Recover the amino acids of this structure.
RNA sequence: GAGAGG
DNA sequence: CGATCCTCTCGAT
């Protein structure tokens, strides 16, 4: 089908290794940035501390709380509180989580992301459930407690983008390479005796034909074939990090087209 | 991990700084500078520890 | 600062997407300038980085102890064995653009220290405020909403510029300035100011 | 030969060459009189002082001596004609540019030169690195330098560390 | 803290210089810039 | 010593010369030794050049001295700045130091001298000698919070 | 305008000299005994070897904001392989009848020596260099 | 003082991996580098996160209050 | 007493940087204080830009009194003083 | 303390507008477009597409200061061709490319196993 | 058992110290070009031997990685700043009422250490983080 | 001194400084909180009444606002507390103490103020964040860096006081300094480095980037220059695009060593009508240099145009470099296996020279020259051999470094580092000195208790054979630390001593000024000079020019 | 007063 | 009777 082309090399719940051909580098990169910064997610944006006899500071705990990945599957059915007509927050624009933990045992008591309890009405939307990729099913150690120790708090998880705070990135590293053979001459290699001998060969070199020494420089050539690998934090499935990345970018171009109309 | 070696004076943690001085009872000869009438001087700063 | 007498302040902050990137998608937490290197001759810094990259890659602690037989050649062997160009150089792509940078960047971990001395504990501004009792001149220090000293040395630069009015304004309208009553005969501040 | 003087004649010449689009193929429209008298009259217009008296006229004559040397060397008939290849148009423009830039170059009464001088000497002295001179090779090169010397000079030290005669 | 607890002070011919005899006794590096340079030492 | 000297064809030529370098000074006596060039004899003891040759040669030697300190550091300062210093140290016919002994004891305003050093004692002798201060100096105007006759205030503005 | 100069040259030397894309060419005309040419060429865009026979032309037309090729129907004075644009910066007379012209094509220098350049090689911001075969 | 959630550089969740790492070291008697790799900490930014972490919380939990 | 007549003036026919600054400053102060403006401001509002215009069109009605070191002075009008700089 | 809110990166302020079209003073048929609360993501992508248009004579973007989200885009077009129309087609071309990609990735993804 | 012994500067004057046990006294009868140049025995009348030359350094300088590869004043500079670096000054911070305390949220032990750091309790109470650093000309900020 | 000559003042502010590639030379970045504390007393005139009403309406907490309204009688209305703070119908003749706004003249300063250039006037630019931002090319007069430095800002409170700052103190007015009759500001760091890299004959640009680079120049005519290359692809050279930043009617000619109008090495400099003809752009052209671009552009175009030239060059170069990259790593200090072998042998031959001379001295064969001791003669010889060795080893290293070497690259541009640095990092650190002599015998007849008595060998008296790359031995380490310390001790002295000199100089010449008769006089009316500088010329309007009649042969002069 | 910052 | 500038913080009388 028509323009840009995709070829999936590897795929799992956590990653997609794919080849993006018949595309401009401006597009490949704009797409790359959108997956990092602009795909909406759900994360803890407010913590009310009832009890903290823990060894860690309120704001230190509150910080890590925001860093816990939360289900963001059905995120477009949730409003940004700023657009929501409620006073403050509500089920149309937020998810409410509860955290009550006490040191019952003489041995150390660990507090996990599995211990947050959804207290608001999710209205059948797949949202707010802490992401657990742990084998023991605990996921994310928030805190540790001693005997008399207690932590009682309430969380308001809201919709947002990494551009506002990194906690909202469905993100994780985006492996990105083009022209593994430097045929384009986009980089001048630093060497001592031999750049070829001194620079390790890219795994992507198998997927491309070597330049061949008896050939003059291809001055007219342009980059089109981007070897990418998108890693997912958990909040959104990999296919979605890319699909919503495409969708978001498409959307923000449409807002320009609509802006031209308005004036 | 506290190492001690300091005092607690009115809740304040005080450190006595090691004071460098010349050792006493040491004979030391010095060439006195050109305009001086005394060519050289042998000195001993006799102390009682 | 790094552990090599390489102190500096934050000029700007950039989010991950603006930052230059590795093809494995690794991004720096810090970008330091090449110019901070040649004159300072702080080679241990560059060796620390090379060693630390091998250490994180291999799950070992680097031995950065002084008088040893640990060499840059030795570390470089181990770094290459990890599939990285032996001198810590890495191909990087521009964050704004996605296009490869012509130059390969020396990149890897380096122990940095967060020093005290933070802007917010230093910013100070005064547009009129508390005056000292004796001199009737601004108070001293940020903590007391004090005025900055416009010392002799500064007085000197205003003379060199020939700014006669600015120099008068600093020493009068800002700071003190008082109206005294003088006798035409003795020329002393004797006059019993009986205003109104 | 290279000395700091006002008015960069070379630059002015270069500017006339571009402004008037001088062709190094055609002969000039100038006269020996145009060049010789031109340069001569220009000299009577380089004012530093203005009083109609002899003390002042000779002081004026004196101040402008070295600049008039530079000017004469650069605006001699063969140079103007063979080297620069100026026209009457370009020549007259150069003559007026020198006068205008010379008059601009004069110090303004009100200039606080004491403080200027002090800071102009003082500032570099702060940047004076090493009290011990870099003459580490030969042991007979041991003359006081840097900040210790600058102090000997300024305090007019009767008892200097390195008194020395240089005999020709 | 450790540094402060192993610090030296010298009140008032060439005292600021790292003397030969300091080897193994006082640190060659650790001394304050400007002010008490070579007068404040560390074991 | 290296020496740039004009050749018989016009150009400057390097013509090396044997030069004697001394430890200690006796200008008056050495200059009369036969075999030397009493025209070229020099000393870094500008006080002696002053005593033997006069204030003007003292001044020229004082510039050479100040110049050399600046130049040894590889730095360059314009002639006029060091000339002004040297002239100021010179105008009295002798060598006046840039010290409380030198310039600060001169005929200047009491309020300007006290601003430097020996503050109180300058002010005590001012009262005792019953001195008058012009208030023509920068310092007295800074003390008075008045526009000094410097650049901007070095002239009056009228209608 | 039209052509100002046109000739065939035999390349003697090709020197890289610390550059990777650029080479300074040393060449003499195949027709005129006195006719010399020294020139900086982009060997990445147009490779040159020793003893190569190249046709060289100095023309002045085929001025305002440069418009992208847009070859749609755009026809230029190029039946050539390599074309530059530069500034006439010097006209050195190497005695009697010998004249040399200096041209900088964005800092890629050129020195053409001969005699017959006369009523053709003007001191222009103009000059297109056109090389073929 | 407790495992950071997420690697500072890339954002990979690391806060769920600490206990598993200690076990890999102790129970399985593996080396730090293979322990890190078994956890799926492939890049060096994620590797420094865990290997370099100092768990002072254990020390803090020792204080009786 | 003292004064030099117009005929016999020996100081620069040129305005000094110090004269121009003080002139522009004084006039700026006047304009800033609702004083009348001697030139047509063309959308101009800043007192200084206005004084600069009044200076450029020689409509500043001020006189510079140039003191010589003996105490004698030379009165020069802003009108007559040449503005090179 | 003097830090702006992070929403100021992507949220328009009261008074601010997305696009602000100014006619260029230096050249005929040229226009300058200020894009508020947008960075390199939109700027690079748009500038690149405008160069793909044969009636586009100039296309460049710049982000004058990193502190502020805004960028400026300069377009010069062929006599007869309006810069706003050039920006329009560039946008639709991007949207049609993005649409094509979404489907192509979705197609590929469905063939996968894991 | 008299295997080790205490020496002051006065006694230091009467003795001959080898710098390394091995690398100063085995026997004589190829080289690594990468390795630094070491002179030799050239004196073999030793009475003593250094426990370890890195012991010539005090607390602060003992934190520097490879100070033998740095221009000396930089080591003096680092010595000053190490005292201005926040970490975990004491484990009981939460219990004390100090006038001012600065604690790092996530102190990290350095990837590059010194053998002396074991005794200085550095990896136990660290004052820094292993930032991924790029040495580059980026935006010019 | 503390109360009259100097005093604490109101309308002053202070903070940590930061650089800003995107700030004009004459600008200063003011943190919003500071702009909000500091005020200007503006009189209500019909020309501002609308703006003042709005500012009073914004009040003290929203930026373009104000705190205090002063009316007749002189009563201050506190805009943060007044119940009528939202009322206020301004009247002409009232004053509004408005917040500091964009373009206001402010006095910016870095202590110590050794210069008049240490205290200059800038245009306010209100910005987020808590630091003062400044243009990189203003760093030098202030002697500023961003390793924790703080600077001070002073606010003029009078129309004439603002005129004084804008017309006498302004940054552009200070570009060319009277101190050394040359610019005190020039292109530095990244810009100096990238301007070289951009200027290489090899450096070519494609349409896409060119267009972006052109637009990055605010003074751009809108005209795309015709590309240097028109063949398989239009390709512009770096020299070409950088010439857009250079205004017209700018002529510059240089000639370095082998410069020949055909400039083989691309050295020297030739700029005609603001178009660079040949010559790699570096420190000699674009630095604080005597007859460079900056000294020329100020004199030719003017101070305002010259200050734009800073930004214009910064904008193009910073952008091109942002896209090119520039680094430095451990690999840049490494020389060839063969170079190292040659360095190693260079040192061993120096080691033998010292042995032979020693053996000779010990045989009573060494004769001392008139005026110096046999031992002084020996020490002088040994040190020369040892310095020669470091220099020879270093030159060996420098030569081996490729043009792609990042350290070599920074040295070529003149942005950071010199020969020594290459030599000490790559080849050999060399001899350590204390009090101008090699390491002294602090122990009886030895430097360290690891040596035997009466050992005058290089290693024994402080010769660092190794490079910072190879690493120093404990003996070498200690001796280097000894040499190092002497530096910090005099740094500490050659600051308090020079500060006292500076004061004395300033106090003694304070009152000397140029009078209306071109005379140089003190406060007493006493003559110092009859004509200032003997020529009555301002030092900033003077430059080194050749006196053509003095040199050459009598035949050359005639011709 | 000491400790520090450039 | 001199002995850099300015800036900060702390504790104690
Ligand atoms: Mg600094
Ligand atoms: Zn809601
Ligand atoms: Zn009276
Ligand atoms: Zn990571």
């Amino acid at each position: 089908e028509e323009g840009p082309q995709v070829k999936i090399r590897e795929a799992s719940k956590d990653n997609v290794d794919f080849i993006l051909s018949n595309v401009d580098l401006a597009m490949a990169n704009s797409l790359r940035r959108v997956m990092i910064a602009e795909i909406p997610t759900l994360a803890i944006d407010s913590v009310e501390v009832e009890t903290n006899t823990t060894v860690l500071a309120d704001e230190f705990i509150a910080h890590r709380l925001g860093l816990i990945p939360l289900q963001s599957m059905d995120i477009e059915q949730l409003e940004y509180s700023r657009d929501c007509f409620c006073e403050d927050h509500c089920d149309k624009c937020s998810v409410v989580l509860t955290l009550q933990a006490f040191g019952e045992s003489e041995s150390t008591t660990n507090v996990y992301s599995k211990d947050l309890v959804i207290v608001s009405n999710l209205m059948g939307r797949n949202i707010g459930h802490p992401i657990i990729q742990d084998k023991e099913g605990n996921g994310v150690l928030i805190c540790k407690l001693r005997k008399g120790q207690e932590l009682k708090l309430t969380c308001v998880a809201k919709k947002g983008i990494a551009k506002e705070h990194a906690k909202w990135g469905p993100a994780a590293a985006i492996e990105f390479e083009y022209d593994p053979w430097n045929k384009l001459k986009h980089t001048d290699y630093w060497y001592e005796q031999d750049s070829a001998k001194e620079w390790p060969q890219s795994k992507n070199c198998e997927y491309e034909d070597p330049p061949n020494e008896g050939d003059p420089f291809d001055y007219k050539a342009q980059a089109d074939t981007f070897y990418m690998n998108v890693e997912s934090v958990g909040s959104i499935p990999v296919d979605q990090v890319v699909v919503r990345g495409i969708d978001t970018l498409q959307k923000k171009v449409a807002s320009i087209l609509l802006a031209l109309t308005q004036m | 991990f506290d190492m001690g070696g300091y005092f607690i004076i009115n809740g304040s943690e005080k450190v006595l700084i090691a004071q460098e001085r010349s050792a006493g009872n040491i004979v030391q000869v010095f060439k006195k500078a050109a305009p001086s009438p005394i060519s050289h001087v042998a000195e001993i700063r006799s102390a009682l520890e | 600062a790094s552990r090599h007498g390489q102190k500096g302040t934050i000029g700007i902050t950039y989010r991950r997407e603006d930052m230059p990137f590795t093809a494995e998608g690794i991004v720096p937490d810090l970008i330091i300038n090449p110019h901070a290197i040649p004159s300072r001759m702080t080679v241990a810094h560059l060796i620390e980085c090379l060693l630390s990259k091998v250490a994180a890659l291999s799950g070992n602690e680097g031995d950065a102890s002084p008088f040893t037989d640990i060499t840059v050649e030795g570390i470089s062997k181990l770094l290459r064995e990890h599939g990285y160009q032996s001198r810590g150089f890495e191909v990087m792509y521009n964050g704004h653009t996605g296009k490869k940078l012509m130059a390969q960047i020396f990149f890897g971990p380096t122990y940095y220290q967060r020093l005290r001395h933070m802007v917010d504990d230093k910013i100070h501004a005064r547009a009129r405020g508390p005056m000292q009792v004796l001199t009737r001149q601004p108070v001293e220090g940020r903590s007391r909403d004090g005025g900055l000293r416009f010392g002799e040395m500064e007085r000197d630069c205003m003379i060199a510029h020939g700014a006669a009015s600015f120099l008068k304004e600093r020493l009068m309208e800002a700071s003190d300035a008082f109206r005294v009553h003088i006798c035409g005969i003795c020329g002393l501040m004797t006059v019993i100011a009986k205003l109104n | 030969a290279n000395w700091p003087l006002p008015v960069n004649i070379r630059r002015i010449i270069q500017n006339a060459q571009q402004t008037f689009h001088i062709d190094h193929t055609k002969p000039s429209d100038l006269t020996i009189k145009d060049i010789v008298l031109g340069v001569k009259d220009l000299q009577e217009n380089l004012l530093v002082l203005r009083g109609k008296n002899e003390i002042i006229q000779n002081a004026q004559r004196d101040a402008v001596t070295l600049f008039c040397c530079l000017l004469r060397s650069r605006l001699a008939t063969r140079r103007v004609l063979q080297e620069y290849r100026l026209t009457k148009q370009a020549f007259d423009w150069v003559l007026s540019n020198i006068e205008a830039q010379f008059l601009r170059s004069v110090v303004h009464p009100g200039e606080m030169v004491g403080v200027l001088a002090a800071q102009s000497i003082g500032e570099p002295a702060t940047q004076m690195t090493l009290n011990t001179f870099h003459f580490a090779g030969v042991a007979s090169k041991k003359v006081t330098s840097g900040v210790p010397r600058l102090k000997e000079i300024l305090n007019v030290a009767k008892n200097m560390k390195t008194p020395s005669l240089t005999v020709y | 803290t450790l540094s402060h607890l192993r610090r030296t002070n010298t009140p008032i011919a060439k005292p600021r210089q790292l003397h030969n005899t300091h080897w193994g006794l006082v640190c060659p590096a650790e001394t304050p810039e400007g002010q008490a340079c070579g007068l404040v030492k560390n074991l | 010593y290296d020496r740039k000297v004009p050749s018989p064809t016009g150009e400057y030529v390097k013509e090396p010369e044997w030069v004697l370098e001394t430890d200690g000074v006796n200008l008056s006596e050495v200059m009369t030794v036969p075999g030397i060039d009493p025209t070229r004899i020099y000393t870094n003891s500008f006080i002696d050049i002053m005593e033997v040759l006069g204030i003007e040669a003292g001044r020229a030697a004082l510039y050479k001295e100040v110049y050399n300190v600046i130049a040894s550091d590889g730095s360059y300062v314009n002639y006029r700045h060091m000339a002004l210093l040297v002239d100021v140290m010179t105008t009295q016919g002798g060598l006046t130091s840039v010290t409380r002994h030198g310039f600060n004891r001169s005929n200047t305003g009491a309020l300007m001298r006290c601003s430097f050093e020996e503050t109180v004692e300058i002010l005590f002798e001012a009262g005792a000698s019953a001195e008058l201060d012009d208030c023509r100096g920068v310092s007295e105007n800074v003390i008075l919070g008045q526009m000094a006759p410097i650049g901007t205030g070095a002239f009056d503005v009228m209608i | 305008s039209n052509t100002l100069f046109d000739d065939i040259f035999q390349v003697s030397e090709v020197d890289p000299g610390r550059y990777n894309k650029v080479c300074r060419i040393e060449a003499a005309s195949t027709t005129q005994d006195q006719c010399k040419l020294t020139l900086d060429i982009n060997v990445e865009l147009f490779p040159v070897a020793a003893q190569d026979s190249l046709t060289v032309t100095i023309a002045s037309s085929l001025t305002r904001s440069w418009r992208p090729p847009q070859a749609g129907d755009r026809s230029l004075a190029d039946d050539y392989d390599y074309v530059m644009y530069g500034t006439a910066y010097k006209f050195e007379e190497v005695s009697k009848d010998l004249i040399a012209v200096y041209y900088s094509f964005g800092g890629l220098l050129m020195r053409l020596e001969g005699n017959y350049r006369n009523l053709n090689n003007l001191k222009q911001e103009n000059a297109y260099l056109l090389i073929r075969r | 003082m407790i495992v950071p959630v997420r690697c500072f550089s890339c954002g990979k969740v690391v806060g769920d991996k600490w206990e598993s790492y200690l076990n890999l070291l102790q129970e399985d008697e593996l080396d730090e580098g293979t322990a890190l790799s078994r956890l799926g900490l492939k890049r060096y930014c994620c590797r420094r996160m865990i290997l370099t972490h100092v768990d002072l919380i254990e020390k803090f939990l020792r204080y009786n209050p | 007493e003292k004064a030099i007549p117009k005929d016999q003036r020996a100081t620069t026919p040129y305005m000094t940087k110090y004269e121009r600054a003080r002139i522009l400053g004084t006039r700026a102060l006047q304009i800033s204080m609702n004083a009348p403006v001697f030139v047509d401001l063309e959308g101009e509002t800043d007192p200084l830009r206005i004084a600069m215009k009044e200076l450029a069109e020689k409509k500043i009605p001020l006189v510079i009194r140039r003191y010589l070191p003996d105490g004698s002075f030379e009165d020069w009008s802003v009108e007559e003083l040449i503005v090179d700089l | 303390m003097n830090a702006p809110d992070r929403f100021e990166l992507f949220l328009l302020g009261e008074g601010e507008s997305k696009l602000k079209i100014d006619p260029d003073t230096k050249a005929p048929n040229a226009v300058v477009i200020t894009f508020e609360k947008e960075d390199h993501t939109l700027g690079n992508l748009i500038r690149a597409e405008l160069l793909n248009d044969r009636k586009v004579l100039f296309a460049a973007y710049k982000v004058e200061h990193p502190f502020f989200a805004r960028f400026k885009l300069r377009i010069q077009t062929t006599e007869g061709y309006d810069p706003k129309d050039a920006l329009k087609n560039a946008c639709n071309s991007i949207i049609n490319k993005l649409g094509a990609l979404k489907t192509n990735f979705e197609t590929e993804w469905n063939l996968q196993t894991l | 058992e008299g295997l080790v012994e205490y020496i002051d500067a006065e006694e230091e004057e009467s003795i001959l110290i080898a710098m390394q046990p091995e690398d100063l006294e085995p026997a004589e009868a190829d080289v690594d070009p990468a390795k630094r140049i070491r002179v030799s025995h050239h004196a073999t009348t030793f009475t003593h031997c250094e426990i370890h030359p890195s012991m010539i350094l005090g607390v602060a300088a003992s934190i520097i990685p490879f100070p033998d590869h740095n221009q000396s004043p930089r080591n003096t500079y680092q010595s000053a700043m190490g005292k201005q670096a926040m970490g975990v000054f004491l484990t009981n911070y939460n219990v004390r009422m100090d006038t001012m305390a600065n604690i790092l949220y996530y102190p990290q032990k350095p990837l590059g250490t010194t053998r002396a750091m074991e005794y200085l309790k550095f990896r136990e109470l660290p004052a820094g983080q292993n930032a991924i650093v790029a040495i580059a000309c980026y935006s010019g900020y | 001194r503390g109360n009259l000559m100097g005093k604490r003042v109101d309308f002053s502010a202070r903070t940590v400084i930061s650089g800003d590639p995107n700030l004009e030379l004459d600008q200063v970045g003011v943190p919003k909180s500071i702009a909000k504390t500091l005020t200007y007393p503006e009189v209500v005139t019909p020309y501002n009444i609308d703006r003042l009403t709005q500012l009073v309406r914004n009040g003290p907490n929203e930026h373009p606002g104000a705190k205090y309204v002063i009316r007749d009688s002189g009563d201050r209305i506190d805009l943060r507390y007044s119940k009528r703070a939202g009322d206020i119908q301004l009247q002409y003749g009232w004053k509004v103490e408005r917040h500091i706004m964009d373009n206001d003249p402010v006095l910016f300063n870095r202590q110590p103020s050794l210069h008049k250039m240490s205290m200059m006037a800038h245009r306010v630019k209100v910005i987020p964040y808590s630091t003062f931002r400044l243009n990189l090319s203003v760093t030098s007069p202030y002697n500023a860096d961003f390793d924790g430095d703080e600077m001070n800002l002073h606010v003029p409170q009078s129309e004439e006081t603002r005129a004084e700052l804008s017309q006498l103190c302004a940054v552009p007015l200070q570009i060319v300094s009277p101190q050394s009759n040359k610019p005190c500001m020039g292109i530095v760091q990244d810009t100096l480095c990238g301007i070289r890299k951009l200027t290489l004959r090899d450096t070519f640009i494609e349409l896409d980037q060119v267009l972006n680079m052109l637009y990055w120049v605010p003074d751009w005519d809108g005209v795309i220059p015709t590309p240097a290359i028109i063949k398989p692809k239009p390709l512009w050279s770096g020299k070409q695009i950088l010439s857009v930043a250079i205004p017209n009617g700018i002529h510059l000619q240089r000639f370095d060593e082998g410069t020949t109008l055909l400039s083989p090495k691309d050295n020297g400099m030739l700029i005609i009508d603001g178009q660079i003809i040949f010559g790699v752009v570096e420190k000699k052209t674009v630095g604080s240099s005597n007859g460079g671009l900056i000294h020329v552009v100020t004199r030719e175009k003017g101070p305002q145009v010259c200050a734009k030239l800073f930004g214009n060059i910064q904008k193009v170069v910073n952008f091109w470099l942002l896209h090119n990259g520039f680094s430095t790593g451990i690999g840049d200090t490494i020389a060839d296996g063969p170079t190292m072998r040659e360095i190693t042998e260079t040192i061993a031959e120096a080691k033998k020279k010292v042995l032979d001379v020693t053996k000779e001295a010990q045989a009573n064969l060494l004769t001392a020259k008139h005026g110096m001791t046999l031992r002084e003669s020996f020490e002088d010889n040994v040190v020369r051999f040892l310095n020669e060795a470091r220099d020879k080893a270093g030159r060996l290293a420098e030569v081996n470094l490729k043009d792609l070497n990042n350290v070599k690259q920074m040295v070529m541009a003149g942005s950071k580092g010199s020969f020594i640095n290459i030599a000490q990092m790559s080849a050999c650190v060399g001899q350590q000195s204390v009090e101008g002599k090699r390491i002294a015998f602090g122990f009886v007849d030895r430097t360290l208790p690891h040596f035997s008595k009466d050992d005058y060998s290089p290693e024994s008296k402080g010769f660092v054979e190794n490079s910072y790359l190879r690493g120093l031995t404990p003996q070498e380490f200690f001796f280097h630390a000894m040499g190092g310390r002497e530096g910090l001790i005099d740094t500490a002295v050659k600051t308090a001593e020079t500060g006292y000199i500076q004061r004395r100089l300033v106090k003694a010449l304070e009152d000397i000024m140029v009078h209306y008769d071109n005379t140089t006089r003190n406060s007493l009316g006493n003559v110092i000079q009859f004509i200032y500088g003997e020529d009555g010329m301002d030092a900033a309007h003077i430059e080194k020019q050749s006196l053509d009649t003095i040199g050459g042969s009598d035949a050359a002069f005639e011709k």
